[PDB]
Design a protein around this nucleic acid. Sequence first.
RNA 1: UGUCCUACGCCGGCAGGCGCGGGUAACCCGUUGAACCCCAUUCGUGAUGGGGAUCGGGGAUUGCAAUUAUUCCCCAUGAACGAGGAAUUCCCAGUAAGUGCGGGUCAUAAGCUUGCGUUGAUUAAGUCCCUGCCCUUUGUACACCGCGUCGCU
RNA 2: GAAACCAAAGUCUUUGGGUUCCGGGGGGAGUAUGGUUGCAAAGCUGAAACUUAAAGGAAUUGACGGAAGGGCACCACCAGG
Lengths: 61, 324
Amino acid sequence: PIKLARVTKVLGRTGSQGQCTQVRVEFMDDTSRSIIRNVKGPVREGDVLTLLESEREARRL
Amino acid sequence: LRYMSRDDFRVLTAVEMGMKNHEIVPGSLIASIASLKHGGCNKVLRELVKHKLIAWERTKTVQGYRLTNAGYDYLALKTLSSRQVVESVGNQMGVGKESDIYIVANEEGQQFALKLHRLGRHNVSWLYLSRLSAMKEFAYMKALYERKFPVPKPIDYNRHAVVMELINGYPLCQIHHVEDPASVYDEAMELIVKLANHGLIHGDFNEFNLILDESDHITMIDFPQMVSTSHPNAEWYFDRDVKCIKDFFMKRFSYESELFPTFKDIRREDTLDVESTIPPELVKQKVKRQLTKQQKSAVRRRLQKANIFTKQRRENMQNIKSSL
RNA sequence: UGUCCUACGCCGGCAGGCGCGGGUAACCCGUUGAACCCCAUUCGUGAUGGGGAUCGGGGAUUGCAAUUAUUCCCCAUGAACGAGGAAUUCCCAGUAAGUGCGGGUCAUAAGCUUGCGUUGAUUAAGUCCCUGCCCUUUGUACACCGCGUCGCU
RNA sequence: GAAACCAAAGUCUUUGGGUUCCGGGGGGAGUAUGGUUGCAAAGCUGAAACUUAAAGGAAUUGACGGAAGGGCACCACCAGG
């Protein structure tokens, strides 16, 4: 199962070398699940993503 | 080379014991803990600094001596010679920035190899990490030779130095033509299967690390980086090594592969991934130990008595008198 | 850049000689007539015609002198080299890199050094992980317990 | 008062209210011996030979932290050439 995504707000830069971006993700399954994920590469406010799995949640707390 | 063999051992081991607790060792500690000869040790240290055995260190107040790399190498070689392992030196230098290869010959004349770990904050961390690397490398060679892998026989080790079995040959990179590529290639996947069976995956299994003993035997060395198969990335390292060997064989010898082993078999072999009742003699020994302890404390507190400050004060007083 | 820089013609395979002119210089070299690049031919995945060293002969300059090849030119021999580990250098947009040109000691000697133009990108616009460096706060003027046996005067 | 501090550690070279115990550079050493008490463990009294140029007490700055926080750099890294 592959689910579509959306960028709501870019939060910050995480990782050892500052290579990852911690971002907030809104779902295109008409749900309001805003889940905080980690992405690699350049992202801006308004980008659209392809998640291989959605049940995993990134590093929160 | 060495000519006199009386007290450089004791002074240099005193320096080694000084390095184990702190950076720069004063001469008072050396004179206290090397007490066989007294008074003449200053000229001994003056004789050592004419070589690259020890080095002086007097910046602004700290005044001491430290051990160099060559002094540590000669200390290990002297400890090997005490074990009757090295008599003469073969000058076939394998000059690497991570390790130095020196041929050695025993009293019998049989030649062995000598690996001296040179790792490149000051050099005490370099020597300590060289010691740890030599220890873990000797442990890995012992494990691999116990598991009958085609590796040389380990012989001895002293604190960075490894006396190791000598097998002559060339690495697989600089051998342009191989008469029988298929047999040694099948043996290469056999060794890959054996390593993966032994709960181990190399990660950087390179052709440069493979030495062709007369282009007939495979010699394998250099295991400080050896990792586990319990890691989730283990099969990715294993497949990287397999594809590296494959692309090297279809790229360099123009020989195409016939067998394609992609087996992860753990762990059907040994898991190497972790790898007046008291007699008077005792009374005499204990009382002698006590009195040597008080006299060693006395020697410490007597040898701990900066003349540079007194010289500067005298010069300042003389300048104040001659200028005013 | 230049009084050694060369325009033109002839003899020249060819480096080069011969007769002639300019330039002490936005003038003459010089619309500086560049090179990759482009457009057509042949070669066709092999130590190949790729790659050119190392040698053998001649020729012509430079210089009082080229023998230990100064340099270049004409044939011939074709070596290693099959994309290079551990490790390491440099690099943010006319940038790296490829490509040629000019200056430097100089009689001929330039794989060095320094600038210039031409074609022109990938990635990033983030961090203290590694390597260091720079500040702020903060305490501080090698203690103890875990190296020996025997031998004669 | 050497000071930290102290209404007492004050009324001290402007030194005397009565009186008890007790110290004399650091070790040897609270050791040996002797006496005494105790079932014992040990308690009380207690040296010398010798060794040593020092040991200590108060405060004052802060190399060096294996102490912690920030910032900067392709002569550091990340993604790359």
